[PDB]
Design a protein around this ligand. Structure first.
Ligand SMILES: Cc1cc2nc3c(=O)[nH]c(=O)nc-3n(C[C@H](O)[C@H](O)[C@H](O)COP(=O)(O)OP(=O)(O)OC[C@H]3O[C@@H](n4cnc5c(N)ncnc54)[C@H](O)[C@@H]3O)c2cc1C
Ligand SMILES: Cc1cc2nc3c(=O)[nH]c(=O)nc-3n(C[C@H](O)[C@H](O)[C@H](O)COP(=O)(O)OP(=O)(O)OC[C@H]3O[C@@H](n4cnc5c(N)ncnc54)[C@H](O)[C@@H]3O)c2cc1C
Ligand SMILES: Nc1ncnc2c1ncn2[C@@H]1O[C@H](COP(=O)(O)OP(=O)(O)OC[C@H]2OC[C@H](O)[C@@H]2O)[C@@H](O)[C@H]1OP(=O)(O)O
Ligand SMILES: Nc1ncnc2c1ncn2[C@@H]1O[C@H](COP(=O)(O)OP(=O)(O)OC[C@H]2OC[C@H](O)[C@@H]2O)[C@@H](O)[C@H]1OP(=O)(O)O
Lengths: 482, 482
């Protein structure tokens, strides 16, 4: 409607967190949220990427995949389950989507409850105080606010140069919302999204292939990333390595013929799929905002908004947070916390800056990969090989023994300073429930734990996590880690 | 055979760990291990209580129980599993026992490999240097060693005053080794063993009742312990509260008639069961050792061996470790580490004492209960109510949402010093994979983490463990923790 103390652009992780906390500190607040449909026509309700097309539906479909492995395990443990059990996509999708819809509805209620006005409106900047929104019926509204927070996230990237990509392909925005099973799927890319989605698809019994141009998980510890794909490949996910697509043709059968260049052989290859998922990175949502008309600068390389440590862009009453802000982890919890701390600096007398250092993650691949702190390469880059010590182990989950499941690849490494007491720099855990395991150790890093303090931490037995506290074989010794 | 550098009595967690590490430091070592059958005739191979009748088979049968819940979850996630699935005890038991046998065999091999002589012999002290062992064929052997380590563990207690208890009842020693299903089971006691076993029995579909005289889990945080049983009772485990048995009669049908006094009503009650499991604590294995003949003192109250900080009893060349040693957590990892550190102080020039402070545990109840540090009561006892701050939360695992499972009771509390930065004193987590979650936070405690450092630790999303790092509602505020 009118002027506001705070207007937030983007009803997502960072923006809803900021809006709510601004409204709890007594402020008059608006949020504008609009979901522009994917090129395939997928759109969804309030809450942003995590809620609707990110962490939440991803985690749940991963769990669908894990549950199929649980069912096989169960017969070793005495359950007389009738054995090739079928999976129904539609039952899954339906359940997953219903939970997402309950989150859309919980966010609306929390807005209503805190008296935040939500405008289902596609905002762009008219000046540095003012924004024009257009609803789904083509109606324009004008909103201005004293302070503006842009938390507009990003969306899936499409390739250029691949004819048929835009017409026939789908992205992570569509996958969670498919009416029917995608059947035989090519996943193009090598990121955590690519590997996560490929993973759960293989896990629910679909014929799945991953096309990587180069390395898996660029920017993640490379020895870990390669364990993660080795596991995926032993467990039924196909990999086209050193391959890049060149065009897609839709066949009379509605199947999709993919042509690609294969750099490991030097030949062009072809294969036929039911679905092609592009998961080749994401682009920040800034181009439509008319940033120019507000004086809001963006780094041209990526299309992100340039911010300082207090989350301010180049216009002083204006902030950006989450995936749209340059130099920021693209994670929900960091966007949430940043939004909270910004609300609290603006309206709450707080001086607390957001701390983006040693943030933990987990990749929810079929075997999960949890990490916090430095990769081993970044450590040796920062400090020198001779000033680094690495403790490592292969281990077998107790639950894998009776289940007869493969623990090759259940591997942990802890990267440290070499001089005593050996400050821990990074932890890397591949195994079941890796995000459960990792979290507490992020606190140890925050506190400046050493390997000395790790040796003196007693294990909980029997657990996988205790193997972290049992680590004792150094890479420098060259002794057997299994 | 002869004299040895080190002789260990008890081929269990602490003793095998000590023997192996003594032998890796170049020493000539013997271990004597003998399993005296349970009153019901159950016996088993090398490795001690954890391997054969403790953590390992307990954890695996818990997992059997969890897998039955996984199968129900799976149909919500799209798996078309045929639904009341039956459980076969015998398939389970067989699998569990085979894995135990593989551990018995791995320990024999590791002894052989390190050239430790294993005497399957029931040792007792003839003097402070010398021990007589008697094999299963009644043959006596004499062994002496310069240093002796007693790591003889404990066994299940039987009640006095309950006629029929010794004849008809079984203990944790028997449960893992049953040929047939125990069918309808009364579990007498209120300890973690009682609640663990009751739990997995209910979980594999057996009609299960727990008889508690008093409180659940004496010595554990009482609000947590009561959540744990509330969950067990919502999920099909029956509880007779304030009840104590008085005798058991075997009926012509071979069923077991239990009479008890019920203190909450004041009446005697009766009920008929197929199995009665006594889980009313454990007694240290010292009475047969002829400790008297070595000068080795025991605390009369319990029958434990009195040790100092270096694990020495009252005879200087002689040590005790594990469950038999007074004032020591009865846990495998503490017994293992103590054995390692003792080997290293004796034969390795180390000065490192074992640290028994802030050891983490997990109770592997149907909903798992992980903790480390102080209970809330011990905190307020040590520091005063006005000098303590408690952060708490109810939460729902994401995986419970689609599965439609009950999260009442998924509760976390973090007990702190009240003055800033609010040093963390205790963490208490009830939820899935609680031992996975807890472990890293034990390291935070070891390092002296504060609540200030907890607020600045970023969550991994979506996980249960992140809820620990999200804690913000204090009991002092009186605000809603859900
Ligand atoms: C498939 C996938 C899996 C993921 N898995 C995880 C994970 O497991 N853990 C994790 O931490 N993170 C995960 N993430 C990343 C996480 O979702 C993001 O880091 C987070 O959602 C970013 O939140 P945000 O505040 O920056 O913006 P978003 O949640 O992206 O919200 C932006 C909102 O603004 C809207 N918007 C854009 N422009 C306008 C405008 N002009 N007017 C009005 N509204 C507009 C968008 O439609 C959206 O609603 C995943 C992401 C994806 C794609
Ligand atoms: C049902 C149950 C569940 C448990 N769950 C867990 C858990 O999940 N996590 C955990 O950490 N702990 C658990 N424990 C406790 C754990 O098993 C013990 O704390 C640990 O095994 C103690 O090891 P130890 O070295 O003291 O002796 P033990 O493993 O008990 O070994 C003692 C060995 O010595 C033998 N022995 C005794 N006397 C003689 C003698 N005269 N001559 C020769 N040999 C002799 C015994 O038969 C046995 O082999 C559990 C225990 C039980 C009963
Ligand atoms: N065109 C093409 N064809 C086939 N496969 C491809 C292609 N482009 C990328 N990819 C792969 O998919 C992944 C996408 O991740 P990324 O671009 O970093 O994700 P974001 O852009 O969301 O990340 C944001 C920024 O932060 C860090 C990162 O550098 C980004 O610039 C990546 O590992 C790529 O392999 P590749 O060989 O490793 O490039
Ligand atoms: N006779 C009888 N009838 C019915 N139920 C009973 C009976 N005796 C104990 N119990 C219950 O079973 C549990 C056994 O645990 P515990 O004796 O502490 O185990 P341990 O002896 O292995 O522990 C070693 C020591 O360390 C700590 C502890 O104090 C011990 O002394 C306990 O919670 C008891 O309830 P209760 O009401 O709480 O007594």
């Amino acid at each position: 409607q009118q002027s506001f103390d705070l207007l937030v652009i983007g009803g997502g992780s960072g923006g809803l967190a900021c809006a709510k906390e601004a409204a709890q500190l007594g402020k008059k607040v608006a949020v504008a949220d609009y979901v522009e449909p994917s090129p395939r026509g997928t759109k969804w309700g309030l809450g942003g990427t995590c809620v609707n097309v990110g962490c939440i539906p991803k985690k749940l479909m991963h769990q669908a995949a894990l549950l199929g492995g649980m069912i096989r395990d169960a017969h070793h443990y005495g359950w007389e389950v009738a054995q090739p059990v079928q999976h129904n996509w539609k039952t899954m999708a339906e359940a997953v989507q219903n939970h997402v819809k309950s989150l859309n509805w919980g966010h609306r209620v929390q807005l209503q409850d805190r008296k935040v006005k939500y405008f289902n409106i596609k905002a762009s900047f008219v000046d540095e105080h003012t924004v024009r929104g257009v609803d789904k019926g083509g109606k324009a509204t004008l909103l201005s606010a004293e302070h503006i927070v842009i938390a507009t996230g990003g969306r899936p990237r499409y390739p250029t140069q691949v004819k048929g990509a835009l017409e026939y392909g789908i992205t992570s925005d569509d996958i969670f919302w498919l009416k029917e099973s995608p059947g035989k799927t090519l996943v193009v890319g090598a990121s955590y999204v690519a590997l996560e989605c490929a993973g759960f698809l293989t896990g629910i019994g679909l014929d799945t292939t991953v096309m990587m141009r180069s390395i898996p998980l660029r920017g993640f510890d490379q020895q870990m990333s390669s364990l993660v794909t080795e596991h995926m490949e032993s467990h039924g996910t196909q990999f086209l390595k050193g391959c890049v697509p060149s065009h897609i043709k839709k066949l009379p059968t509605n199947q999709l013929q993919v042509t690609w260049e294969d750099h490991a052989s030097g030949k062009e290859d072809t294969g036929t799929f039911d679905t092609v998922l592009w998961a080749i990175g994401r682009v920040p949502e800034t181009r439509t905002l008319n940033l120019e008309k507000a004086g809001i600068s963006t780094n041209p390389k990526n299309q992100k908004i340039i911010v300082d440590a207090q989350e301010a862009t180049s216009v002083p009453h204006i902030y950006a947070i989450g995936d749209v802000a340059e130099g920021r982890p693209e994670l929900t919890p960091t966007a949430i916390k940043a939004g909270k701390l910004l609300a609290q600096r603006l309206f709450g007398k707080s001086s607390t800056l957001m701390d983006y250092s040693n943030v933990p993650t987990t990749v929810f691949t079929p075997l999960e990969y949890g990490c916090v702190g430095l990769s081993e390469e970044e450590a040796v880059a920062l400090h020198g090989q001779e000033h680094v010590e690495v403790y490592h182990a292969y281990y077998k989950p107790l639950e894998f023994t009776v289940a007869d499941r493969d623990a090759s690849q259940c591997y942990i490494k802890m990267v440290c300073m070499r001089e005593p007491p050996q400050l821990v720099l990074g932890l890397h855990f591949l195994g079941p429930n890796a995000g459960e395991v990792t979290q507490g150790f992020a606190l140890g890093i925050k506190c400046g734990a050493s390997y000395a303090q790790v040796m003196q931490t007693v294990g909980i037995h029997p657990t996988c996590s205790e193997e972290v506290v049992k680590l004792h074989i150094s890479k420098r010794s060259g002794l057997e880690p299994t």
